[PDB]
């Protein structure tokens, strides 16, 4: 019942599109120890709506991999539509061959394990961060076509990696604003 | 279970408001009316300096030209709050903020918002709820990491214009058609 | 309880008819006005060639000629559907297709139809529903093996012939 | 919920061989073995004529050429099916049929199956298991209209060629 | 607990009467009309030769000058009851019968009557019935023994007699 | 779900013998040895039918030919069927009579063989039960018509023929 | 919980009063007419003497001086109750006494009143019921030792004493 | 839920007010093989009613130990108002300084067990005959101050014993 | 969760009065006319002087004054409590109290007040009740203590205080 | 049923000590070695004068003569406490107090104790537990009437004589 944000983050195992367009499994504890995991959601693939988000946070993998974070995306699609979605150039509507991961919850299951389901039907727009030792330090769950720049992200990442080893920073000059 | 995009959970409290009297404020008030940006924070008094109040506090006039109530919330009893407001920021305080502190005695908003840590303080969060009482934006952090007041500021924009907040679509994005 | 020769368990769907625009159907619009010939299939977009739903819209008039709605129905969503007709029948497409295909996206349609496997996608089935809402017929297959239109179009032309003059050779 | 794609329920009964002896047959004694063609009818003795029972009768070197055994199900006896057996097709009989007929006399296969119409007869059916015992095809009829023996075979050699 | 002596469970069945159509016989059009002779059998067209069924049916005016109803039953579908009295003795068959056979095809009137066997088939068993819908006797075989048409009038004489001229028996 | 065709529910009960004492029987102890012919009456003292029970004993020879036990029981106490056998033919006695009497003063072996009714008294009834334990035949009267020793004696042969023959 | 000192469980029974004929007893004919001394034994025709229901018997004319109804009750039948009066005292039978004794076939009677031993006899007791219903007094003995019937009577005395005059001492 | 008349007698155990007015604790189990026990209830002390049973039981003692009997007294009231109960004279309405024991079934468990209790408040005025192996032979239950003669408790006993170890007679 | 600030739960008990007769007190014959101060104490006839009743007898007058009902109560019954006071103070007894005392012969009122000790008897408790039914003031003690007299009539006059103006 | 007489529930807290340091204060550290006097209070910061804390803290050395642990507690976090600690007597604060204030968060620790009001905020209350862990006394007011330091001094003393010596006869 109460919220998984800073207690060990839902377990998954999931099917998988990887960049090179073959098919696996990624489960969450595969990273633990090793990883920080940015586990995002979106409702679905093929929309009228730009995949602005999936394109940009791709152009920036090289900022993830600086940071060791494994950058997953996710949907209730299957990995056939995620692939599909891959192999329709961006004229035609498609993402292209982007190099993360990208996860299939066809049962919902991650969704509903996260919190993030909409009407027993789609994921919401959400960013989960988790940590080396699986515990959610971030949460961020948005309901309309809202969006994220990727250099907030970064910056999110960057005060959680730094508070995790010097604690609470006090701004200078906090009391102007 | 989430809330985000449904209506908004119910809350009464306690709370103090900018001219330090005490009163009380529930959600119905605001339905139909007013959008809500409703913050959580653990405590009053710690050694976490209260930097993001203060920057919401100074940003309240941006809150209000858009039509949005900013209400704070802790667990804390409203005469902390109101103590609080009356030790100076150079002694670890808040000071004269004009804006509204509701007090959850009971952890009810907490609990009903999934935002209450180990049934004692919340965590540090925010809550976007539109005029008609539906939630569109939810953040939750573990951590004292701040956030920015403009950020915030252009999610708030995003969402009244009905526009796409994130990074620029790629030129060569066209959504597909048939042969 | 099977739902075979019993009413057929109601369904309310989104879906993307043959000018590609987005609506509803509702099992209900057809109760005394259509026969209702209602397909599954687990998934678009797989590396299974889809000869049958382009088997069965090659075959539409000869469904419409028996009064019969044609309804393809899968776990995918609405723009998933609309992708798929976008698609090339070389690169595993299935063109632009007149009939209608329902998402089911909740999965409950599959659920309250008993074809749903695994809590993810349906088994390919074929359910014949009267015009009185009754189910006439079942199939259920677990392999991409197909199944004849023509036989589909036998079996519905013996069930009107049935229901109008009963059973003896 | 279906069983398709699944373990075929499990299923006992005295049967009516096509020599006429009485026995008995069960789902485990094909497990390995045999594909197994199950197919369930209301009743003996109808007015309904029994062409579909007679039309798999002449397609029984198909079924055996395939590795499959073919049963037929009936809630009725032991006793009837024989009896129906020793009736003449031009007396509403089905005469000599070479494949086996099955007694569902506590009508549990018919609920197994979930093809038992009220608590009385079953429905027109068949249910192609394969040789692990995993249910692969299943069509239910409401009304006599019938199946073609050619599809049958199509589907069992669509199975058969993955 | 038993229903000998209490009313008796009701029915409902499909029947094939005497000129072999089909129809359907309720238990209460007899009350307060016919005494019912409710017989059961196991099955139709078994190794078992019927002498029983056509001795039963060669005394159907015995039983109707004691306003009697003689009803056969077993869990038999109509059809097999049909086909059956279309068989010739000769063949294992009943023949044209003139009383009705009833079709327990849900097993629930064998069930009710608590004859029915390893939830197949029917036990060979006699229940009478009075005009009142009480049942006064029954009698419940497991093998073919049989039972003499004799034997049953005198019970039913017995029975009769006693409903109205004292319940006494004699040395 | 009747006993017919199954076991015999078993029964343990105190009884009154031939010889006018005290005793227990139960069905275990006829099981691959004698055929067991239970009859189930009501009550003893009423001056319906004494006669019944007379005839019974006076065809214990052609009984223990067929290999028969022959056991009758009601729901009065040992002590009430020891003083009607006591009793003379004339004041409604039955005499002292060979076979054994059971007492069912619990009323829990007429409720086993579904012959109780309204909770107080057995209906009249016959069960006969083979040298397997295996109930072949039962009998229920709402009425006191009685019943001949010759019907009972050709459903015994009847039986007994049936089991060394089959059905001819 | 007890039923002494509340309303006395209701019985209607079969009966053998004093004349030989049969009838029936039910608690409510005896509320605002008399009181009722009801006492309950095993078993008739056994080899226990029944001294109790002699004495008792023989002390009726002083049952009737008080307004009490004497009562005797087991498990056997009416039938039994009949042929054990119709037996000689010398034969083990109790003769024609002139108080009814009250027959518990279905053992509902002993059951209420918390008297019956292992589903099967009653256990000797005494059940003394006011004019209002209500128990005053049970005693209950598992052993076959009689009770005085001058005590009895010395105990119906006092109840309708103190029922008129309250507590009072000594003794 | 059957009587307890010829089974075991409920398990009780209860503080005490001694013969010698000490405090105490008795249980039924320290008397099995070694006594019989006369376990008699009453509502309680300091009535109106006067407590004439509890005194003519106390000058039989004599008797009581002769044939191996343990009388136990019991109401509901505390161990301190039987003693306060025994240091009240006789010419008060005390019953003096009585050498047989009196129980306090002061949770009134022992009153529910035996099925004496009234009113889930008081117990009835009742007699429990317990023999050496526990068994109840002999159960009397009054709801009125009638009183009970020490010489019918006597014969009673004696019949019981006799009948024990002998089995049944008739009388003369 | 405790009733101090709440409904005082409901009482009803056979009672002795200061006249020495027996009768009936309910706590609704109290609600808007006037305070209650029940008391509890475990048992009659103790080795434990009875000081305190006694010393709330004499004071009677000053509760009287506070329109205060003073109850005491214990799990004895009305004949214990009677014969209690028909003891003499010099030999272990209360004497001719002018104050009701309840007798708790079910238990119900220990049980329902929280003040019940192993399903035997009462501990020594103080409960003061307000004109609105309200419990303002509850004391428990294990032990054979005491109070004070002067410290209930302080924390009534405090509590009628706070009624009339606040803190 | 009431934890009076009987262990004193157990609690875990975090805690501010005399020299404004954070800390831990469990039940069990004290068991067999000092007496606790716990204490509950609504809030801090209140319109309601903390003098009741103030005059147990100018009392400390009577608690630690008597060797008892005097423990205050409000459903207030830590550093609530340490902030009204911080707060001068003049503003509504209670200054530096040398006796530990727990932090019931939670508000476990008052629900516990049964002293929680609405589920927000702890009664004013008073619990002595023994050295064995015994609750002996339990105080519970509604109101801000406040309580002498004489009278807790007085029962301390009361308690600890009682187990020395019995009850006191006169008084």
Same mark, same amino acid.
């Given at each position: 019942?109460?919220?998984?944000?800073?207690? /060990?983050?839902?377990? @998954?195992?999931?099917?998988?599109?990887?960049?090179?367009?073959? @098919?696996? /499994?990624?489960?969450?504890? *595969?990273?633990?120890?090793?990883?920080?995991?940015?586990?995002?959601?979106? +409702?679905?693939?093929?929309? @009228?709506?730009? +995949?602005?988000?999936?394109?940009?946070?791709?152009?920036?993998?090289? $900022? @993830?991999? /600086?940071?060791? %974070? /494994?950058?997953?995306?996710?949907?209730?699609?299957?990995?056939?539509?995620?692939?599909?979605?891959?192999?329709?150039?961006? $004229?035609?509507?498609?993402?292209?061959?982007? #190099?993360?991961?990208?996860?299939?919850?066809?049962?919902?299951?991650?969704?509903?394990?996260?919190?993030?389901?909409?009407?027993?039907?789609?994921?919401?727009?959400?960013? %989960?961060?988790?940590?080396?030792?699986?515990?959610? *330090?971030?949460?961020?769950?948005?309901?309309?076509?809202?969006?994220?720049?990727?250099?907030?992200?970064?910056?999110?990442?960057?005060?959680? *990696?730094?508070?995790?080893?010097?604690?609470? %920073?006090?701004? $200078?000059?906090?009391? #102007?604003?």
């Amino acid at each position: 019942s109460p919220t998984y944000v800073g207690k /060990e983050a839902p377990f @998954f195992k999931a099917e998988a599109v990887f960049g090179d367009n073959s @098919f696996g /499994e990624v489960n969450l504890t *595969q990273f633990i120890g090793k990883k920080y995991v940015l586990l995002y959601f979106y +409702p679905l693939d093929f929309t @009228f709506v730009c +995949p602005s988000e999936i394109i940009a946070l791709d152009k920036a993998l090289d $900022a @993830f991999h /600086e940071r060791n %974070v /494994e950058l997953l995306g996710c949907s209730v699609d299957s990995k056939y539509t995620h692939l599909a979605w891959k192999k329709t150039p961006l $004229a035609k509507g498609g993402i292209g061959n982007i #190099k993360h991961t990208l996860l299939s919850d066809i049962t919902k299951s991650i969704s509903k394990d996260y919190n993030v389901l909409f009407d027993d039907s789609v994921s919401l727009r959400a960013f %989960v961060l988790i940590d080396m030792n699986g515990i959610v *330090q971030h949460l961020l769950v948005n309901n309309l076509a809202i969006g994220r720049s990727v250099d907030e992200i970064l910056r999110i990442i960057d005060a959680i *990696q730094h508070h995790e080893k010097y604690g609470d %920073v006090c701004p $200078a000059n906090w009391q #102007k604003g």
